[PDB]
Amino acid sequence: LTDDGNKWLYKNKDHGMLSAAASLGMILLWDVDGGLTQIDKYLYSSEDYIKSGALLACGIVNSGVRNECDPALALLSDYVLHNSNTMRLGSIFGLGLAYAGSNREDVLTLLLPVMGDSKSSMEVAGVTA
Amino acid sequence: TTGIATIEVFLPPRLKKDRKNLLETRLHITGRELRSKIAETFGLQENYIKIVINKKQLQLGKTLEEQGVAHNVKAMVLELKQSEEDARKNFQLEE
């Protein structure tokens, strides 16, 4: 998943891409630098649908740890409002993993509009709650 | 004071130095100058470092006084194998 990943994922149809991309972040947990730098070859994929995939990887890497620079909110926030339903699935879910139990008012507040965003699909909602 | 503050930035592990190598510089020159000055002072590439600043990200199209970055604005300098924009190309290849 670190050398020929573009080749590997390309043989996964949509949701397959989502899963494979997310594992990129879980392959490197507890490294907001190494993983985040191991987070620099896919997410912006020609099938940008996999963006949720690295977003889970983006959120997953921050799960179980807290960095003073608050990376999870920064990267994810710009795409939690992304119109594409799949793009958002990774955003909210990955964000939840990163700050699980943090109870941070900001992220909790930012997650607030996601609940009320009617345009969000139900699958976006279920992960959102 | 005097319209200036100290930026408590964070660098990555692989670039072996004081793990949190601060990034001291002015705040008036543009973000294009930011990666220029976020790289010039403490020995980084103008095009090999992104600065996720105060729970935000550098908008190097804007100056440090306008791009959301500012004085005192702490950042994790991810070891972006390419620039901030080039890891907005590299880190953004997967971002």
Side-chain angles (χ1 to χ4, degrees), chain B residues 21 37 48 66 70:
Chain B
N21 312 292
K37 70 174 173 250
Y48 272 83
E66 76 187 301

Side-chain angles (χ1 to χ4, degrees), chain A residues 18-119:
Chain A
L18 193 47
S19 309
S23 166
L24 271 147
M26 152 196 62
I27 278 176
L28 271 274
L29 307 97
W30 298 322
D31 53 351
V32 176
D33 307 343
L36 270 299
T37 58
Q38 295 237 46
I39 297 315
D40 66 1
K41 204 191 47 58
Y42 311 78
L43 167 28
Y44 265 176
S45 165
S46 44
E47 177 196 357
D48 50 1
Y49 161 108
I50 90 167
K51 293 209 189 180
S52 42
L55 292 208
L56 313 172
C58 285
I60 199 165
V61 163
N62 283 302
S63 75
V65 282
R66 284 211 211 171
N67 274 195
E68 303 201 344
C69 308
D70 181 282
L73 186 170
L75 191 134
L76 280 283
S77 58
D78 289 341
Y79 281 42
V80 287
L81 62 143
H82 199 311
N83 216 28
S84 194
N85 281 335
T86 290
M87 314 318 135
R88 190 173 296 175
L89 259 53
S91 305
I92 56 176
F93 196 19
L95 189 68
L97 299 128
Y99 289 159
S102 307
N103 284 252
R104 294 251 310 281
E105 300 186 354
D106 46 351
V107 177
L108 290 169
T109 45
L110 176 150
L111 277 278
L112 304 185
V114 192
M115 344 288 297
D117 180 18
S118 175
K119 159 266 163 187

